[PDB]
Homo-oligomer: A and B are copies of this chain.
Amino acid sequence: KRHRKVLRDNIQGITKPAIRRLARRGGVKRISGLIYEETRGVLKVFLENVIRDAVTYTEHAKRKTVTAMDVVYALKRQGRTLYGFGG
């Protein structure tokens, strides 16, 4: 009836290794200890903002499913045009 956990993943899965893999692509050489809590605060205010505009388009069509063309349409407004994931 219910997954006993209701945490809905609390900004989790961004484990120390994942943030130490994205940073290394960037060029970072000696990541400091406190960065991990902060980089789970910047991802958070971004995933919400693409999402609030994404739901707003779907409710306009009255459908209940967030298709990828809705995420490509929301991402253009904020400023970054993803090319091709949805087309």
Interface residues, chain A, CB within 8 Å of chain B?
Answer: 1-6
| Copies of the polypeptide in the assembly | 3
For A4, what are the chain B residues with a Cβ–Cβ distance below 8 Å?
Answer: 2
CA distance A35 to B24 in the complex (A): 35
Closest partner residue, chain B, to A6 (CB atom): B5
Known: A1-B3, A2-B5. 6 other contacts (CB 8 A): A1-B1, A1-B2, A2-B2, A2-B3, A2-B4, A5-B6
Specify which of A2, A4, A6 lies most central, judged by the most chain B CB atoms within 10 Å of its CB. A2
